[PDB]
Amino acid sequence: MEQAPEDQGPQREPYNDWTLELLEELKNEAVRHFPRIWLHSLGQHIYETYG
């Protein structure tokens, strides 16, 4: 074993020493292609957040 374990199919598990780094990737992903992680996320929390 020398890789991030899927665990019951493709499923998140950020705890591992592998994913300690793949977390680094994931957050990198969340600060690379992140405009609509602000804009469609808000677009969503406006549309859904009616009142």
Curated annotation (Swiss-Prot):
HIV-1 lineages are divided in three main groups, M (for Major), O (for Outlier), and N (for New, or Non-M, Non-O). The vast majority of strains found worldwide belong to the group M. Group O seems to be endemic to and largely confined to Cameroon and neighboring countries in West Central Africa, where these viruses represent a small minority of HIV-1 strains. The group N is represented by a limited number of isolates from Cameroonian persons. The group M is further subdivided in 9 clades or subtypes (A to D, F to H, J and K). This is Protein Vpr. It comes from the Viruses. GO terms for biological process: DNA-templated transcription; monoatomic ion transmembrane transport; protein homooligomerization; regulation of DNA-templated transcription; symbiont entry into host cell; symbiont-mediated activation of host apoptosis; symbiont-mediated arrest of host cell cycle during G2/M transition; viral penetration into host nucleus. Keywords: Activator, AIDS, Apoptosis, Cell cycle, Host G2/M cell cycle arrest by virus, Host nucleus, Host-virus interaction, Ion channel, Ion transport, Modulation of host cell cycle by virus, Phosphoprotein, Transcription, Transcription regulation, Transport, Viral penetration into host nucleus, Virion, Virus entry into host cell. Disulfide bonds: none annotated. It is found in: Virion; Host nucleus; Host extracellular space. The chain holds residues 1 to 51 of 96 of the full protein. It comes from Human immunodeficiency virus type 1 group M subtype B (strain 89.6). Homooligomer, may form homodimer. Interacts with p6-gag region of the Pr55 Gag precursor protein through a (Leu-X-X)4 motif near the C-terminus of the P6gag protein. Interacts with host UNG. May interact with host RAD23A/HHR23A. Interacts with host VPRBP/DCAF1, leading to hijack the CUL4A-RBX1-DDB1-DCAF1/VPRBP complex, mediating ubiquitination of host proteins such as TERT and ZGPAT and arrest of the cell cycle in G2 phase.
